[PDB]
Design a protein around this ligand. Sequence first.
Ligand SMILES: NC(=O)c1ccno1
Ligand SMILES: NC(=O)c1ccno1
Lengths: 215, 211
Amino acid sequence: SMKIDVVTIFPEYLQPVRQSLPGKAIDAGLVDVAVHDLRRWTHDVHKSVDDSPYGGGPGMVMKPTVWGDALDEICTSETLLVVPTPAGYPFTQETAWQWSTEDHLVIACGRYEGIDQRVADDAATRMRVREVSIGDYVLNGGEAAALVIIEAVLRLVPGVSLLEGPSYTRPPSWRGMDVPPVLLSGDHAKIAAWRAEQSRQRTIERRPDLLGFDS
Amino acid sequence: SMKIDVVTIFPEYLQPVRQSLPGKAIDAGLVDVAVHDLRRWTHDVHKSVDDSPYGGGPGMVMKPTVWGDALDEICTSETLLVVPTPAGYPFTQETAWQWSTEDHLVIACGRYEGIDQRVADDAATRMRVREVSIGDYVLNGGEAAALVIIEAVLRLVPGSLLEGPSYTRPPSWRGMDVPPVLLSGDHAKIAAWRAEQSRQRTIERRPDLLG
Ligand SMILES: NC(=O)c1ccno1
Ligand SMILES: NC(=O)c1ccno1
């Protein structure tokens, strides 16, 4: 079993849904996903979680005090604390495999301007902390990135390179477009060869970096 | 006045939520987002959406006849058809900016093994088609990637180096002080300090961005 806690000011957005990969995982008892409203650890009447940045700049920064209290209650020294951010280390397939063996993930969802950096630094003194980016784009907060991380990790939990080329299924002809004959041929070796070629051809066109080329 | 149609076999999972950025934009009438259940266009009582891959192998491939019908109904000549897939061109900030000014986005969510390639190939003869990956990892399907694309695009709708650490009150917290420069009132010095913090963080976390 794995435990995933998600902490956010948008709990409804993160609520697990039965008809999904994580929903199935939960229903199969392979993971328990709990979502927590950050505002649960506020004290003021207006339940404030952010404040203007020191030193100036646009937007707001999430308060360290509120987060400090939330992670105190939720994390232990065994927790892997995940903090999605466009400024993070890259989250990759290797990361997903690694996190798929973790007992307890806690995902701190905050606006992209940041949680006050002292939260992560403080946490780092008692648990492992991973600030990570799921890609080279900006989201308003870590919520959608949390959903992506959960999806990528859970499909790897026991009991649940190059680009893959095109795939086909029935019928063999459709709207005047035919399935590549080799795929119909039953010749496993020629098919493996064809798919390896297609894969390399797609990779060089769409992701030349993966093959050690420019752009 | 952007229209986004999403097609998926998991419509609940993708149902917009009021308490979220997309929900706020929807509530503010800056975008219309429609979620369509792909099974509306299935032909059999079993409501079949995929089938075994030609040439063999594990997994399933989504049926072209079903997707062909769905896209025929939903897409127009002005549509930009988005297909999230780990085999796609990279989706980046530049992409999100481009797509932010589109009139009609249709996002086709499929399992990662793929939609029969003829669907995209056929659609591309009467509309613009973009197969894109949101990152170097595999998801079971394009659903979560659709959410990310929608978040990245919508926050840009009128309506480098990494960013360094940020701080707010209180000035001292659990033994840690906000960098005094930030309180100095020397705004040119602050900008230079932030640049150096950005450089150091980029070196440490994303060396690839420096070349
Ligand atoms: N690129 C990202 O992972 C991200 C997280 C929050 N906002 O953007
Ligand atoms: N990396 C991706 O965008 C993706 C889409 C579906 N599965 O993975």
